[PDB]
From TrEMBL, chains A, D:
The active site is at 49 (proton acceptor), 60 (proton acceptor). HAMAP family: Trp_synth_alpha. This is Tryptophan synthase alpha chain. The lineage of its organism: Bacteria, Pseudomonadati, Pseudomonadota, Gammaproteobacteria, Enterobacterales. Its EC number is 4.2.1.20. It comes from Salmonella typhimurium. The gene is trpA. PROSITE patterns: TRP_SYNTHASE_ALPHA. Tetramer of two alpha and two beta chains. InterPro entries: Aldolase_TIM (IPR013785), RibuloseP-bd_barrel (IPR011060), Trp_synthase_alpha_AS (IPR018204), Trp_synthase_suA (IPR002028).
């Protein structure tokens, strides 16, 4: 399908950036996670980035580490995540859905079979966090064979060779990393690097979404004003879940407020 | 693109977040440069000789082989400064850190021997050292925590997951992905992303080189086999490397069998796991049906790790090295035997290697065989653990 | 009548109950025989090299002397198997025991390093070992108690008197006076009745011999001074002996000052005691006005002894060696400095020697001097004691 | 004086051996110690062996170690021991009194001065336990200059050279050691060695008293029947003191009974 291409064309026509929340699938349980995801969409999410719980998430700080653990405590497995994804797609036919995967979960019982499962449930992109472009060949090949966009990362200090490779190999969107380190709301990323945004455009890369440490509307606005197509926020969203575990109605109200304000900032 | 091959057959690679690739490339370039640099080699040799105390002895152990046709030597890495083989490669990596203009060190440790090595090298060479250690290991290897702190290292207990070596590894890598501009990650085993399996081997290979020279002097011939325990694989690849091209010489690696392979409470992925991608490498690992990483178990903290270095996976695959397992109880028996009959207190890790050598002898006592066991460390760190066990056992 | 001179000037002799004189004469004859016996010398050399790991390194310590005109080397007896210099002479005395047809060993220990040495040698060479240790020392040097027992030695706590080294010595000698037909008393220091001060020196003198060769290689000249701590005197006479005839070379021995000489809580009889007869010898000792033996004190168990070997009393008397004292707090500072700045954890005993070298440097920082400190042991046994102190101190 | 010579001549005329108890001076206090010593004499002791408390008594087992400690707990010093000795001699003009000394207490502030003090209070012999014949010259010279008998030890395995030296250098009595080891009632010595007794007589040595482990009448009888001039018992006596610390009248009654039975055995 062409869900990212269609989204970005629509946003361009409206002179808007994307706001893309991240949550862990099944945190804090399957039913509540599905309601959280429906709330994110209703509140104005343009696309979703969804984590499949993994035992050792090496690119994640404590907030998302804890989300993974809550999902495991609820007995969540990749198979259950694919069941959830099928239900989300059935409700929401056009919203781009991206997965945050760790390599072993993709590699486990065959790379091709993984991407085939993604296509069957209607996923649009996969970002494999611990596979750099240098190791990416079998992943990106399988992705494209199954009509999945493979997502690559442009780090702050990316050299020209890497910019060209990311532009060529990726599809859907380019992940523009705010900063070094691991995920986390407290550690605020730098402003989007204009030079990287400009180079990716020069090389006809998929549109850039800035992520890591984006926790406030001002940061979303700054991403778009720097020329990024949008921004991703994970830890800030997940903190609202963590804070409100015993108050699920309050959880959804706070998620709605936050997502709405972050989306409003994408219009700047 | 790399200068050196990141793979050993199917195994190895550089499976890290994209952010860390420049750091790995920089390290590889610095290593290649240093390996050709006579000043670097002279500095490294000087520290090994005059600071760490190499070469280490090769001890013939007469009492434990009495009545059999086995001749057994022990390579005495237990006599190295710090108390284990870990010190050899930390001195080389600390020199690389300085060469790259880095003033901070991150390390992980399980037995605390890599942590002690990292701390001592940092004290000597003027680096600021922080060490992650699983909270379970902080308890069972407590003497090493005290030693690291007295040498001015920051020791950070890790409570997540199994609270053992894998969890310390995870935290170290997370830290490095944010701190690499100023910090060198001094990985302590022959595992992880390229170029670490290569660097660790090249900075540990004096073990087997010395062993070869010593056994030729004392026996006039190469060993029938060399035997080493296998956590991530550094002491074993250090002993093996110089013998890989000596096709007659058996290479035997000993994984921890824990409470018994059949219990699932072990650390023997090379023979009982399956290939996966974790900790920056494609290698055998203990994993669930769905591909979650399993927690390992061993009585010995330094072997308690659910994967293995990719060169050992490769040597196994081609049949150049054979890998076996030894249980906790077998290791404990070997520990006691060496203390009582040779007057050497070995690390519980090294006791796994010794236990397999003792089995080779006892199973076939009229087989003529010349064996070398890598005695990777001394057991000071383990004496409280072992005492408590033999006590609860009614000894 | 003896083969060798039992005195060093006024000091030394054989002040034991008449019952024990044949045993001392037998030991002296066996020693004289062994010293001329190439097979004995070859066996002893083999154990020292291939089992204990000699020669030990001589490490230059650059960081701690920065900004001064002092060059300081450390003789690394801390790297010997067992963790201290004590292992050298125990291997020689164990061989003498076997030569005399004795199958049991009695030893005393304070720091537990002589006890560990005795236990390891007994395990290797097939002797039954019993070790007396003051109950206070059993507590403050506990890691060594665990090591001795794991090696199959019997460790007997001594609760009488000060419950420290002198009390262990007393019990060992009492035992030997009833068991000498079958047991060798493996005295652990250069003190006691002839022939022990002589034998201990001759089986420790490789320390200074190696030091001389190493410093000539590295500096092209002899040291300005060699510095060693002094309990009973073994590590110091071992370092001194080969330099006694090199008149330019200063010999500096460091007694424990405890809480301060002025408090009377010390172990510095050579400079602060007076000549008496105890433990088989005529030597300086801490004694009351009426001639009762005083209890000593030091933070370091291995120095906590109210007398000193007679050859040190003699070398002092003629001015060939100078003796000084270092307090507990000075020793602790030196311990910390070496851990933090050189990455070496020294025994608290050895820390007294290092502390005096650091004072020599700091007092006269523009004095050109080449110094060697005998680093007699490693501080693993002390880490719990030192931690507890810096903790109670608010560090 | 000639107190041992006179005693042995008298015993010879009566065809008797000597019984010689040992106690520590001042155990368990000065007053009680003096009464104990008077009891030993009244009950039939032929001579006394008296210990001066020393901090580190290397030839003594736990029983006599503990006697030394009790004396120290009562504040006993060598000076007080000399005061006691003067009082004992004033009461008992002919009984031979021997001291058990450790070297440092003799050497402390001058060997000659020590033996001079012994002569002034009327001591007859000194046995310095940790000075073998090989180291004895200044001790035996000072002893003889002050009319004190220096006591030497004949151990079980004594060679001929030692027998000749002990015969020549000693006076008063020769100490015939029962066994190796340290003092103690529990560790029973062997029968007196006939060959040693016979050799000492051949070499005109002072008469032999057997000591170490002599705790029973049968052992005293055996010593005399083997040709020794008598026997010494210490630990067995000291145990009676230790047992009866809270019952001083009972202490003296038990000491009297024991000493009387041991002396009776010397007549065999
Ligand atoms: O808002 P934060 O700080 O929690 O960051 C949210 C990120 N969530 S995500 O799925 O985009 C994401 C994207 C990439 C990651 O690692 C990689 F860069 F190495 F590939 C990890 C998570
Ligand atoms: O009856 P026991 O077993 O207590 O022995 C009593 C001995 N008391 S003593 O004063 O004769 C005595 C005599 C000699 C001693 O040591 C020496 F032989 F080395 F000289 C010690 C004590
Ligand atoms: C993992 C640690 N130690 C491992 C170790 C091992 C196993 O690790 P290698 O497989 O990397 O040698 C073997 N022997 C000793 C004495 C060890 O300390 C550590 O000290 O951090
Ligand atoms: C008395 C003991 N140790 C003494 C010692 C000493 C002091 O003893 P000498 O004076 O005999 O060297 C010095 N250094 C170390 C490491 C020591 O262990 C003992 O281990 O029994
Ligand atoms: Cl609610
Ligand atoms: Cl009464
Ligand atoms: Cs053999
Ligand atoms: Cs392992
Ligand atoms: Cs200097
Ligand atoms: Cs001393």
């Amino acid at each position: 399908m062409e869900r990212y291409e269609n989204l970005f064309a629509q946003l361009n026509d409206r002179r808007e950036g994307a706001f893309v929340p991240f949550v862990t699938l099944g945190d804090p349980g399957i039913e509540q996670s599905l309601k959280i995801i429906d709330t994110l969409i209703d509140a104005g999410a343009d696309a979703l980035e969804l984590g499949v719980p993994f035992s050792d998430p090496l690119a994640d700080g404590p907030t998302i580490q804890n989300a993974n653990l809550r999902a495991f405590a609820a007995g969540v497995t990749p198979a259950q995540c694919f069941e959830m994804l099928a239900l989300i797609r059935e409700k929401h036919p056009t919203i781009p859905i991206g997965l945050l995967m760790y390599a072993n979960l993709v590699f486990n019982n065959g790379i091709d079979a993984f991407y085939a499962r993604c296509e069957q449930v209607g996923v649009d992109s996969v970002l494999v966090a611990d596979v750099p472009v240098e190791e990416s060949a079998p992943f990106r090949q399988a992705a494209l064979r199954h009509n999945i966009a493979p997502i690559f990362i442009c780090p702050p200090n990316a050299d020209d060779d890497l910019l060209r490779q990311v532009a060529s190999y990726g599809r859907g969107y380019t992940y523009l990393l705010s900063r070094s380190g691991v995920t986390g709301a407290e550690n605020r990323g730098a402003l989007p690097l204009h030079h990287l945004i400009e180079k990716l455009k020069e090389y006809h890369a998929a549109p850039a979404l800035q992520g890591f440490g984006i926790s406030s509307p001002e940061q979303v606005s700054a991403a778009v004003r720097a020329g990024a197509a949008g921004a991703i926020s994970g830890s800030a969203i997940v903190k609202i879940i963590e804070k409100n575990l015993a108050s699920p109605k309050q959880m959804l109200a706070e998620l709605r407020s936050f997502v709405s304000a972050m989306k409003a900032a994408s219009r700047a | 693109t790399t200068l050196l091959n990141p793979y050993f057959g199917e195994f190895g690679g550089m499976y890290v977040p994209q952010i860390l690739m420049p750091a790995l490339n920089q390290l590889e370039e610095a290593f290649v440069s240093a390996q050709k640099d006579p000043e670097f080699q002279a500095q490294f040799a000087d520290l090994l000789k005059n600071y760490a105390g190499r070469p280490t002895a090769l001890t013939k152990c007469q009492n434990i082989t009495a009545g059999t046709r086995t001749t057994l030597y022990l390579k005495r890495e237990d006599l190295l400064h710090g108390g284990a083989h870990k010190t050899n490669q930390v001195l080389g990596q600390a020199l690389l850190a300085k060469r790259m203009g880095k003033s901070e060190i991150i390390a992980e440790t399980g037995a605390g021997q890599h942590g002690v090595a990292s701390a001592l090298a940092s004290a000597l060479l003027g680096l600021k050292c922080r060490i992650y250690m699983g909270a379970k290991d902080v308890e069972r290897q407590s003497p090493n925590v005290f030693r690291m702190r007295l040498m001015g290292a920051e020791v950070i207990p890790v409570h997540s997951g199994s609270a053992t070596l894998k969890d310390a590894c995870n935290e170290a890598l997370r830290d490095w992905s944010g701190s690499y501009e100023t910090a060198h990650y001094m990985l302590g085993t022959a595992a992880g992303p390229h170029p670490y399996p290569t660097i660790v081997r090249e900075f540990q290979r004096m073990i087997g080189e010395e062993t070869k020279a010593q056994i030729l002097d004392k026996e006039g011939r190469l060993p029938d086999a060399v035997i080493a325990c296998v956590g991530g694989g550094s002491n074993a690849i250090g002993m093996f490397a110089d013998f890989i091209n000596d096709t007659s010489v058996g290479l035997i690696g000993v994984e921890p069998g824990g409470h018994g392979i059949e219990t699932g409470e072990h650390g023997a992925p090379l023979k009982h796991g399956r290939v996966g991608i974790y900790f920056g490498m494609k290698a055998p690992m203990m994993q669930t049906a769905d591909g979650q990483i399993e927690e390992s178990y061993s009585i010995s903290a330094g072997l308690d790790f659910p994967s293995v270095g990719p060169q050992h996976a490769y040597l196994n695959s081609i049949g150049r090295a054979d890998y076996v397992s030894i249980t906790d109880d077998e290791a404990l028996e070997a520990f006691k035997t060496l203390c009582r009959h040779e007057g050497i207190i070995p690390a519980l890790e090294s006791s796994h290697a010794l236990a397999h050598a003792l089995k080779m002898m006892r199973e076939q006592p009229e087989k003529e065989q010349l064996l070398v066991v890598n005695l990777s460390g001394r057991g000071d760190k383990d004496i409280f653990t072992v005492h408590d066990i033999l006590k609860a056992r009614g000894e």
